[model samples]
Target chain A: VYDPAQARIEAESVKAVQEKMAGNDDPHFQTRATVIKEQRAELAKHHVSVLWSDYFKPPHFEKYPELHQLVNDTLKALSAAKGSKDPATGQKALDYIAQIDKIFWETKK
Target chain B: CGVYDPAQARIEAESVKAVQEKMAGNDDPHFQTRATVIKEQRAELAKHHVSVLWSDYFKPPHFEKYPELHQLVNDTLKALSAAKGSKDPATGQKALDYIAQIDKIFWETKKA
Candidate 1:
């Protein structure tokens, strides 16, 4: 098991990386350091919620082949976003999220 | 099969936007420097990743929930552990592959 010293050094290295990255005019990096920290505490409350929530335990895509394709396509868009290294794909991801949103909010039963 | 929740969809869209607003570091001004930084700090990168995985982020039921994230962390930690305890060069190389796997999806400044 890692001891306290390792944890301390780990934390220090983390800060160093963030601060070092921020030097690159990445005020975004500066901002990310804080936002991600807040999100971690946010996780404690949301952690097992994914397990209990039907949200994560997605249904067998084999049954909903179309939905499966859309889900894969959605992530492909996310991957595309990463590949573009631009918000162009991020907006594309939002569109995919919206399409999924529509099934619940706007779909006809 | 049933689909994922639209409510979850809605929440996630906002979270994605948070990044859109805050993580725009890949533009012309900083991308090249950051790319070089990636190469510069990679050796340093793996150790911190090992430690962060050990943190409370994936403790308990959370680990049980994320099959891939859980798998990634376990694979990397064990491989890294195996690397240090190396009985061989091939074993050390196997561990480096785990870190590469994490790097593929989660590169800083590269993640969306």
Candidate 2:
């Protein structure tokens, strides 16, 4: 059984990332990155809900072939960037998300 | 999307009304105020928020699982944000009711 408390951790950690993203001064990329990160966080929460339902069917895999790994990798990246104490690590997280997002759009379509 | 519409306001008002009805009895003053605000200025407030929760918040899979949920979320949000002005008793009462219901959910998922 999955620990429900993990969801709290996920939500809290993402919130920290979101707060930092809000205060950053990258005029060009900050807003766009914020939007992407927020959307990704929301989408990730939805995925968590699906997992909780016990209704996670194999057909879900057929529909989105890389979804499981995509979610896993994304979460790991989120964890790493979030744990960093410096701005550079935060930027690295953004880069990782952008890369994943690029591949996600390609495979998603 | 930036511009406003009157019908949208009514939709928001309806949502607040649903939440108010759901939580018809509760003991939180702040929640009561929120509901009052939503009820007193339903149209005007909704015009400001302009949220079509069904269209914006939940995704397709969620809709598929909980068919009635889109409406439920809209109602809950209505209850959360609405605040009736201090004059009307009926509005204030309804607002109090909505607050009670939201309070139940608040403790349920409140972070420790």
Candidate 3:
């Protein structure tokens, strides 16, 4: 569970997308695409922060200390990728996402 | 696929405009805060553009029926560019509104 403030930010971001996509047309296609692309990249960055900022609780942490640090490190790496503003952010984000997926699967059993 | 469909680019543009307006409305209330919020909103909005392209702009049947799908994508992309540059709320709102309509059409067309 995320902090209420952070959750609000997440919800707002999602809502912003809905607002933009709700009424689109031909003349503004490229402009809208730019906004969307920028936003998507931003969202991934936030998710990385969320993962790093203690979204998971102590119970989960107790069972998987390595998991917590793993997520934190991956998120740090993601932040670095974003700060670099290189084309590689996408691939870096994907790797972080994959690591989280792995942790999720490992915890499932 | 294009970010804007023939019928939906305006709304998408407006959406971007709305966000910009909102950000500008507050006027430097801690750059970090503004930047963080804007970044989040921007990322989500970006996903929607990608979504519309994959879901609405292409329309598999249209592609199969007409050889101009690529052209359509190009056209839509041009419109999206306009929306991004739009500084006026009315213009931006217009773009955003059209996008919503397109999203609906996309579902309807798919079902049909």
Best by lDDT: 3
List of clashing residue pairs for candidate 2: B23-B97, B34-B82, B36-B83, B36-B84, B37-B83, B37-B84, B38-B82, B38-B83
Q: List-wise, what DockQ does each model earn?
A: 0.03, 0.01, 0.04
Top candidate (TM-score) = 3
Please give the lDDT score at residue B29 for candidate 2: 39
- Between 1 and 3, whose lDDT is larger? 3
- For residues B1-112, could you state the per-residue lDDT of candidate 2 as single tens digits? 3232334444555565554564567544323443443454553455354345335433566557566655654664454343332333445344345434433333333232
TM-score of each: 0.30, 0.25, 0.36
TM-score for chain B considered on its own, for each of the candidates? 0.42, 0.29, 0.46
Ranking by DockQ: 3, 1, 2
The lDDT values for all models are 0.41, 0.47, 0.50
> Candidate 1: misplaced stretches above 4 Å?
A1-63, A85-87, A106-109, B1-45, B48-112
Could you give candidate 2's per-residue lDDT for residues A20-97 as a string of tens digits? Answer: 655765644444444444444454455445452453356655766776776566556555543333445445444544
lDDT of 1 at A24: 58
The alpha-carbon root-mean-square deviation between model 2 and the true structure, to one decimal in Å, is 16.4
Considering only chain B, report the TM-score of model 2.
0.29
